[PDB]
């Protein structure tokens with residue numbers, strides 16, 4: 001299952017191409033400006049077979065709870081209403097979000113103790129690195 | 134989770150566009166001829182959180198065991214070696230198979246007591262209906 005190494009609290013330490021990724025999602029300028037400035041915190045916990053990923057920032061907080069491979073409704077930070085599925089590939093935690101015929105993916109994997117989130121939307125790619133606290 | 138209504142033994146009663154689907158997978162003629170003639174039987178069982186789908190025919194038998202949303206290695210009836218994931222969407226059991234940069238999906242759902250499998254490969258679509266025994 002999901003490695004317990006994911007469990008814990010994660011602090012953003014780097015972000016690459018987040019602006020263009022947001023633009024591709026349809027996020028407006030003023031919103032992107034605050035989205036880029038946000039030094040977020042991601043918290044991953046588990047109770048039974050149910051995994052929770054909570055994102056905390058000044059601007060917006062989010063939280064999703066899910067079982068692996070079981071679709072669920074999500075309200076994203078920019079307030080898209082998606083049908084989302086989280087799966088496990090080579091230890092990589094892969095979230096896909098579908099809405100209005102569109103699709104984006106957020107892949108989270110552990111690299112040398114850091115969590116590396118890679119976001120993909122229409123060939124636009126961003127990378128965000130977190131370190132555990 | 135996966136509805137217990139899937140559990141049981143299923144007999145093929147109809148198949149539509151299976152030939153073109155096989156062609157799209159790269160299946161050769163003589164193999165397709167036996168693949169089309171095959172009156173298969175699908176058996177779905179569960180032990181804990183692990184689901185097993187066994188396909189039985191004279192020509193070829195197959196069997197896969199998996200957890201929802203967790204990638205696993207599969208050897209298909211035509212002997213492709215794929216990385217596969219099974220997920221749950223609106224009660225639909227969705228298998229995706231990836232190999233050599235390619236992708237195909239087999240979606241299984243229950244309709245009025247029948248199991249309806251829809252296979253997709255490069256816009257080629259097939260439908261196979263099963264009734265429970």
Ligand SMILES: CCCCCCCCCCCCCCCC(=O)O
Nearest residue numbers: 027035038040057060077078117128
């Ligand atoms: C601090 C959160 C973003 C606030 C601004 C809204 C931007 C909309 C896009 C939301 C999806 C962001 C996904 C980031 C993935 C991650 O690093 O966990």
Ligand SMILES: CCCCCCCCCCCCCCCC(=O)O
Nearest residue numbers: 160168171173190193210211250261
């Ligand atoms: C009786 C099985 C097929 C035998 C011939 C090999 C054809 C290769 C394609 C294998 C995938 C078939 C998927 C069918 C889905 C189903 O109805 O469960």
